[PDB]
Ligand SMILES: *[C@@H]1O[C@H](CO)[C@@H](O[C@@H]2O[C@H](CO)[C@@H](O)[C@H](O)[C@H]2NC(C)=O)[C@H](O)[C@H]1NC(C)=O
Ligand SMILES: *[C@@H]1O[C@H](CO)[C@@H](O)[C@H](O)[C@H]1NC(C)=O
Ligand SMILES: *[C@@H]1O[C@H](CO)[C@@H](O)[C@H](O)[C@H]1NC(C)=O
Ligand SMILES: *[C@@H]1O[C@H](CO)[C@@H](O)[C@H](O)[C@H]1NC(C)=O
């Protein structure tokens with residue numbers, strides 16, 4: 001039936017025909033993550049008493065802690081939430097190298113300029129993101145706290161700059177810029193202006209001019225052993241079994257065994273010959289391992305003409321007869337359905353490696 | 362597959378599938394031309410024999 | 411480059427690269443086939459000589 | 460094969476590839492034809508004699524010493540001294556690990572050696 | 584507490600041919616019998632490395648720091664005990680101190696107000712003459728990073744004319760992660776760098792996020808009048824270059840070749 005399906009006909013002719021491949025299915029899963037560590041202070045980051053200005057954005061580093069972004073996303077205490085390199089639904093199980101948190105306050109109109117690859121007042125002269133960004137931007141309206149009727153004009157920002165700044169390049173200089181041929185002399189002068197200006201933030205102000213507390217959560221991957229993860233579910237290190245595995249976010253499938261490879265105390269993630277990922281060292285325990293994808297191959301159906309009979313033979317090429325689940329093994333592979341004989345005849349159906357089949361009484 | 366959501370993953374996967382398709386097609390064409398050359402050589406060898 | 415912003419000029423450049431690569435690949439394949447024909451002719455001429 | 464090289468055995472990638480048409484059948488047909496052509500080439504080059512001949516044990520060939528090219532009896536195979544010298548004169552798993560299989564030739568080396576020995580015996 | 588030393592021999596710097604040394608592991612992954620090609624910051628083959636003297640003879644100059652630095656010191660009893668990094672070194676930029684105690688190394692990314700010639704003070708008066716900790720600098724007001732780790736003694740004793748100890752360090756600054764690689768070798772030579780090849784084992788890539796452009800070593804040192812073992816250090820400057828490396832089945836980098844050298 002497989003041959004009829006693949007040949008798109010109800011009649012077949014004597015010979016050998018290739019058919020769909022076979023591959024051993026996985027059985028279990030391994031999700032061994034790093035060891036127990038304290039909880040990340042994301043609350044400390046967002047619940048901070050004071051927020052700095054855009055030109056003096058804070059730089060916080062998060063590493064070596066347990067993070068739980070489910071609470072972060074599920075909370076309704078965030079006005080907008082945009083992830084540019086990942087998805088919040090499957091963000092929890094990922095493992096990270098390091099996280100960077102940057103917090104400030106932005107006018108409501110210009111928050112859209114924080115997206116990568118944009119041009120604007122707050123995207124050219126004070127703060128910038130690269131287009132190869134992976135972090136997530138979270139903004140929240142905070143007119144009830146920040147906005148003050150007396151004037152909270154300590155929020156200052158760059159009106160203009162001599163040249164656009166490279167991504168993640170903070171600038172604190174307050175040198176008077178010159179916008180004319182005359183040299184800029186003194187604090188003030190013709191075409192000499194202070195490059196910093198204070199917004200207008202009052203509780204009476206409406207949307208667009210309302211201040212918004214904005215935080216950026218960038219993060220780096222594929223640089224070092226993982227530091228931040230989520231749920232652990234340390235299961236086991238079963239061996240010689242076709243299983244799924246996830247060691248530090250490196251999802252894969254195959255069989256595992258103890259290897260004799262000489263790893264230096266800073267070595268892991270083997271790359272023996274090709275680009276494929278070789279043996280790896282698991283977390284929570286220092287023992288070298290190995291990875292080998294499950295047994296696979298391509299079956300072949302060996303049949304006489306359907307005008308003659310309906311009994312066929314099956315050749316699993318490239319796989320030993322022991323691990324396949326009238327068996328007879330040849331150099332080509334495991335041939336089943338036919339009985340080997342000591343006699344020698346001419347080749348009717350070319351099997352290979354000096355072996356040929358036929359249909360005889 | 363494990364980083365992105367379904368609807369946005371296909372956009373990335375399409376680039377890889379097109380690139381690998383082009384690579385495989387080029388390899389197949391090169392093999393066909395080399396096989397033709399070897400066919401000519403084998404015919405000449407049979408005649409010489 | 412001088413008509414669009416750099417963050418959104420990658421699509422047009424990518425399309426141009428794909429087109430030029432396709433043309434170059436077609437030219438190379440045609441050259442290979444015609445070279446095979448010329449090789450057959452050269453072998454015949456060598457035999458005749 | 461295509462679905463394994465192109466796609467890492469995932470449902471999404473396979474279902475995306477399913478909409479590109481029957482490219483895989485074309486590539487597989489071309490490669491299978493190439494392999495069959497190689498087998499036909501080998502058979503046509505060597506299978507030139509109807510019956511396998513046998514050189515006589517007597518080596519009285521008018522003083523022409525043929526010991527170098529005649530099949531070697533004191534060897535695991537029947538390859539001659541020149542044949543074994545040429546064989547001696549002239550990483551694999553990684554390619555197979557991504558679905559690139561190397562099929563074995565239909566005629567093994569011993570059969571080719573027998574054909575060659577029969578041809579020499581008939582000629583001499 | 585710091586006394587500007589003047590017992591120095593006015594010696595111009597020397598030039599030496601940095602033949603082949605200075606190859607480090609660029610990736611944490613493992614390979615075996617692979618001729619992998621890479622492009623990164625390295626020490627160019629067959630370059631002019633600057634040779635100083637540190638023992639009368641007292642060379643303590645400040646050197647520029649750009650694109651990392653390759654510090655290769657051959658010494659007896661390890662007079663050199665630390666390094667300083669930064670831009671102003673006058674409590675105006677975040678300064679890095681890697682002074683190495685006989686007990687353990689201490690890494691201080693803090694605001695330091697150094698002296699004009701912050702030579703390492705007399706060692707046998709710290710907590711001996713009712714004194715205390717450092718003071719090559721005046722005060723340490725704000726600390727941003729503090730760390731302590733295993734020291735680097737490597738034969739901190741002896742006085743011999745063919746001392747085997749030779750310690751190499753390479754310092755790199757990328758993405759605010761101060762990368763340090765190092766290796767020790769027991770070579771029975773006197774002055775010249777050996778006609779040999781060796782790898783470099785990473786120690787720690789601790790984060791800094793600071794601007795570094797200046798560099799000066801610290802060597803243990805009454806200010807005028809001292810008895811110190813023989814020592815000599817070489818400073819080389821790295822460049823962005825492409826190499827082709829060759830590992831072995833044991834995993835060690837057994838060979839490497841340049842890609843921008845002579846056409847062969
Ligand atoms: C034919 O040639 C063979 C090959 O040289 C001769 O056999 C050699 O005889 C010498 C005599 O000591 C030996 O040292 C070699 O080892 C022999 N070679 C082999 C391959 O056995 C042989 O004598 C020649 N004449 C005849 C009649 O066979
Ligand atoms: C802020 O603090 C309150 C009270 O401790 C807590 O309920 C809330 O979850 C915190 N939220 C953040 C974002 O820190
Ligand atoms: C964590 O570390 C402890 C102490 O080294 C060890 O016993 C344990 O197996 C590790 N892994 C865990 C608790 O999952
Ligand atoms: C059926 O048809 C095939 C045609 O290839 C022929 O070889 C075979 O002998 C036929 N068998 C019978 C029983 O007619």
Ligand SMILES: *[C@@H]1O[C@H](CO)[C@@H](O)[C@H](O)[C@H]1NC(C)=O
Nearest residue numbers: 318319320321322323329334
């Ligand atoms: C297949 O199994 C047999 C049975 O022990 C063994 O001798 C042979 O080496 C196996 N083949 C391979 C390629 O491992």
Ligand SMILES: *[C@@H]1O[C@H](CO)[C@@H](O)[C@H](O)[C@H]1NC(C)=O
Nearest residue numbers: 327328329339340341342343
């Ligand atoms: C015929 O082949 C079978 C299986 O290869 C073998 O066991 C048997 O001994 C053979 N018969 C003779 C007479 O050698």
Ligand SMILES: *[C@@H]1O[C@H](CO)[C@@H](O)[C@H](O)[C@H]1NC(C)=O
Nearest residue numbers: 598599600628629630631632
């Ligand atoms: C080192 O400098 C000297 C003189 O400054 C010069 O002759 C020599 O070529 C330089 N070495 C190299 C490798 O360029």
Ligand SMILES: *[C@@H]1O[C@H](CO)[C@@H](O)[C@H](O)[C@H]1NC(C)=O
Nearest residue numbers: 684685686706709715716717
């Ligand atoms: C480390 O060295 C400094 C400099 O001499 C010294 O003041 C300090 O006491 C040393 N640390 C210890 C633990 O002895």
Ligand SMILES: *[C@@H]1O[C@H](CO)[C@@H](O)[C@H](O)[C@H]1NC(C)=O
Nearest residue numbers: 674675694695723724725726
């Ligand atoms: C230390 O930090 C405080 C508060 O940020 C600042 O007022 C002081 O000038 C700083 N001193 C130095 C030496 O950096």
Ligand SMILES: *[C@@H]1O[C@H](CO)[C@@H](O)[C@H](O)[C@H]1NC(C)=O
Nearest residue numbers: 669670671676793794795796
């Ligand atoms: C470090 O500070 C100096 C001070 O002149 C400056 O020239 C240099 O550009 C700074 N480096 C970086 C990476 O900001």
Ligand SMILES: *[C@@H]1O[C@H](CO)[C@@H](O)[C@H](O)[C@H]1NC(C)=O
Nearest residue numbers: 260261262831832833834835
């Ligand atoms: C290197 O590997 C070879 C073979 O794998 C082994 O014989 C030798 O002892 C190993 N040497 C070291 C230093 O690991």
